[PDB]
Design a protein around this nucleic acid. Sequence first.
DNA 1: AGCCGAGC
DNA 2: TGCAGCTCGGCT
DNA 3: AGCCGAGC
DNA 4: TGCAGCTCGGCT
Lengths: 671, 671
Amino acid sequence: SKIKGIPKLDDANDAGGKHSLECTLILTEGDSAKSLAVSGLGVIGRDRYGVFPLRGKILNVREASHKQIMENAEINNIIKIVGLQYKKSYDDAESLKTLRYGKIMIMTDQDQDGSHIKGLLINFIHHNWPSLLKHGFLEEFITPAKEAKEYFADMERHRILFRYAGPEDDAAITLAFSKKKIDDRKEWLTNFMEDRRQRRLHGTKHLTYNDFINKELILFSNSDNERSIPSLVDGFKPGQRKVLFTCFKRNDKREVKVAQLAGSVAEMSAYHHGEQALMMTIVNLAQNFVGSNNINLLQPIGQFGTRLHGGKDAASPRYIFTMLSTLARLLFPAVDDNLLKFLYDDNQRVEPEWYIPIIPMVLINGAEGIGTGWACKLPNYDAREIVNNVRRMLDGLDPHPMLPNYKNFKGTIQELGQNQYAVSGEIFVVDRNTVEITELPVRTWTQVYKEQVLEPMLNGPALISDYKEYHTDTTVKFVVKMTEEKLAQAEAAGLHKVFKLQTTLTCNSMVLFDHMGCLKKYETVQDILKEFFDLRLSYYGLRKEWLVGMLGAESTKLNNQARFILEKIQGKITIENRSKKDLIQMLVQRGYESDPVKAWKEAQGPDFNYILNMSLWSLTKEKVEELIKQRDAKGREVNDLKRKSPSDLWKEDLAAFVEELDKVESQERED
Amino acid sequence: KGIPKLDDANDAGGKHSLECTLILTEGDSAKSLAVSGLGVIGRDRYGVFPLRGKILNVREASHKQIMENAEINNIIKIVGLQYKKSYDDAESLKTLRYGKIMIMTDQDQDGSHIKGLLINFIHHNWPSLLKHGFLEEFITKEAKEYFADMERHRILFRYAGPEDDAAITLAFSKKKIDDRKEWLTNFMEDRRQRRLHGLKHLTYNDFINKELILFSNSDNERSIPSLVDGFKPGQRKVLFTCFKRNDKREVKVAQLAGSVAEMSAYHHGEQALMMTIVNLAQNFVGSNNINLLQPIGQFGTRLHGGKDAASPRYIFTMLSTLARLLFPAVDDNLLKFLYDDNQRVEPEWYIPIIPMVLINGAEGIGTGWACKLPNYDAREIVNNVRRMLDGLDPHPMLPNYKNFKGTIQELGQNQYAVSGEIFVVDRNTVEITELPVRTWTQVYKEQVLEPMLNGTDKTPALISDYKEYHTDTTVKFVVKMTEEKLAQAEAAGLHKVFKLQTTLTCNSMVLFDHMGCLKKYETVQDILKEFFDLRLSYYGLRKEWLVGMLGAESTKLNNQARFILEKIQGKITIENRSKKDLIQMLVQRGYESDPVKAWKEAQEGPDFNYILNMSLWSLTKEKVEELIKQRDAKGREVNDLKRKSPSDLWKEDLAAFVEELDKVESQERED
DNA sequence: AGCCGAGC
DNA sequence: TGCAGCTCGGCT
DNA sequence: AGCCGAGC
DNA sequence: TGCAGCTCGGCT
Ligand SMILES: [Mg+2]
Ligand SMILES: [Mg+2]
Ligand SMILES: [Mg+2]
Ligand SMILES: [Mg+2]
Ligand SMILES: [Mg+2]
Ligand SMILES: [Mg+2]
């Protein structure tokens, strides 16, 4: 017995014979981990150790469909390598001779995603062959080319075996991977998030399955929510926020390759995941077809996908470029960066907890994500309509209700109820034998509608005679031919119903992280707008309070610089051939202040470098007049700021954003 | 059917088969642009199929290689062609599913090579199809505009007589190698006789001699190294980027490849560029004697000859400390940097302190010519350079590979015998401690020792057992034999039997000289001599450049020190005086315009900014004393440089390189 | 019959 | 250089 | 029977 | 995220 049809398998020499139960199959996380295991086993390892690589997450066979299980290539390989059989028990020690391996050792990364792969394989064995768990079938190889040989030489220190201890292990596995335990995972994760934050005070060989689920796998389930559930403040996820942080710091004025940008994000923001997910995010942030972003913060310089296939027809990230949109810094003012709490990843400032935009971006581009226990789904909302409601709330008026709105969508979105909408396309009769379809429902892609609706109508009973296509890259135009009898019956039943041009939009899972990082469920879009409004209005007061101190410190600096230049050109003070110590002691004696900008930032010996680092040009005629004008202009800038309210500063940013939004969207219609 | 990536025409195979055209594109990216350009009307009589690069040259290929080519067999089934079948008249044109094949590639040199390979494929198997005008080309979203004006972009190949058969044979027959040399020699000659001046149907002869010849010349320019620096244009772009960025931290290879394409205008795929960076960083036995890039990661070992290198997305690299010592930064001011669309990209060549073309063994395969050089010892190269500086004759040099424990004996002119190490332990054991150069460990184990242990269908077994005790950089085989078999192996020669000796022939030392001319070199001493005269001439250029630059810097400090001394004594004042009055007074007092800028302008109003941009600190006591010391130190720096000779400057660079070479190679043995 | 490497 | 799978929750 | 997307 | 082909010339 020896496998022949599996390429990536490095089967053990003694596997399949009578020493099969003494052999261990090593399932690795990827092909890179496979090479590290083969080089670590050396020559002695290939006798009773086999290595097979897994290409990521495996199928959750618990309550999975019968067709998906039999057609899973990754699982069918594991069954053939080990020699397992469905509906067969391995309790009586006998019948263990039909197995080619006696142990399965999981070696993955020591991160959260590695723990998820362990649990999925545990769930795979537990669901099909629970009798193997009561023995010693599953084990793991933990890690902290050359270092691999030291790990396998000290395998007993890195080898941990899973142990079945009773029904509490079956409940823990069911809690994590059963579709019927969704509500239990909410309570399971609510107690974890509570106990984790309630620890403000302060801060082996075998491992039971219950301890693995409730102390190791739960770290993935929480991290899965933290990476997939967006924030209410900026509408971002931690991965999306790292991309925009990097773009803000680099400030690229030229097209930048997506793959090149993804590499820059990983370094400057400490992105600890694969480049495929990061390049996926950058493409998602740049798409602008009907159904994606209402305001794309990155430009789609290249083939980023069309509405024909819903972005699936996007080119490779190695051939497409992107850059910040002109609306990015207008939505995220640079001055507001001084109010954010930037996080640290190993003494490196990486990203803030969240950005604070001028309008709720969580409603503009429709935040959406799937985590563990909870899920989020929000539709797109009109940017101008949101700005209007913000202006109304600044004047003390009640905000108008908002319906979902998608840019360049020619259909209709009618409200059926709270968080329930009817999205309809456009279809009208041309003559007694022709109908025209000029718009599809939101996120109903053209090729999918053609193959799943029009093709069954054309072939197999049949309803239409023929149809032609006259689409562009951004519009839809179907011309369908029918008989007079068939068309008359379609009008009686409803053209939008027959041609499947109406879909329902239900949004009863508006779960987001608040400003304090707590997970909360929101019932209406108005509740999100109100909570964002109070926080953003409070931070416009922080911006003014910060700008008054900074501009005031800059005004004091220019006062000392102008005083020194005026006192020097009049002979009141001299610095020629004077020692550094005597010059500093003379400046402090004449009432000159140390660097006020530095002193103000420290508040959040004497330093006169801001005076003496000025060029000799400063003593010339034209530079004296220029310095006085800048000093007076800075003084008027502080006074003009104190007279303004936080609402005034917000309306200024809103007006500047709407002005550029009109110009950008007008150029898009022309191009 | 049975071809996934094929978008077959609707009318292909039916009664309109001879009216259909098959579009063969250069890659899948061109395929997606061809289907979108045909629109809906195009799919009736136009099929699109993508080619994955260069296709097989079926003229002198083996019969087994032709039948097992998946790319060519697909083209045959789509068109419906048959081998040996003639297509002279209408007797056999009804069995074809397509009537025309249109080649759509990039408008670059490599696109022309794919056209010729497809022309060579049809001409060799079915020459009767060429007289009917079977092959066409499509020269160059925007695709819909191209296919709408197809008549402007559609050029048809025309057969005009026996001169077309000779032109195709000249380009793709292996018996026409010497003819391609003269074919390209006349091109390079006539090309240089045109620089004194300046600057629908298409015949196959005109395609070969006016379009494909541009690739064959560019193929040599990209694959044949230069004598000066031992680099190819692709390798030189990598070193330019690394020199310009000056990375002090580990940089990802894929991230570096993207930076090279932007900063040096690399107009090819990143896969080839990432290949070069890995090749430039390898340091195992058989690769580079002095690797200019560091192998921070899995860059391949001698077990598989670098083929076991990790993905370029997971390995890092950086400049070696010997790079800037071999290529001094001061010499960059003497190079002729090229321009790619008003962007300075790279020099024609770098000028290293030693002939790098001999250190790492430059080698490359072009069209007509090929290059192959072995590695030579760096210290022996430095010693011959020191001898030639003293007017002595350089000693002969044998190939030398770093950390190679074998022997390289000269059998004749440009012919050497490379042997490993094998010795007898006892009457039943032999030990192999070294393999010949570029004989990799895993290849030697599978192709030599395994047939000796088990035997083949032809050769019998020779050894009883063998063990392995290798490291990542050393080889140790312990082989067991019988007394009879060992006696016969010693009689025939242990190095002969165990395949531990290989022949090294170097009769193709073709390189580009300093003037860009292709030249064949008969001995290594001729390469060393031509490099020596050029490098010695540029050390005179460096001194001539340093005398002017240091002299200009000395003049600058003289004016700056004079102004500060004249200001602290009251001899000149600048307070509250106009810019025009201050500049006019400096010219009146004999102050010179910026000498450093004026000197650099000579290498192609009055500027006193270098005086007045100094800080106010310059007037203090300590800064006056510091400025005077810098002025006097620069003056002594000019005199100390004038006293040195171009030979003295060279000996300083050689001594500094050998000192660091000893430290690096000592740390490598420890690490 | 296949390596070497810069290209597709 | 391009192509294939899976998780997790809500909704259809 | 499968989309949505940040992960493997 | 990793895996497969080909050119071109000299040499084994
Ligand atoms: Mg990982
Ligand atoms: Mg979206
Ligand atoms: Mg190209
Ligand atoms: Mg080499
Ligand atoms: Mg599901
Ligand atoms: Mg060949």
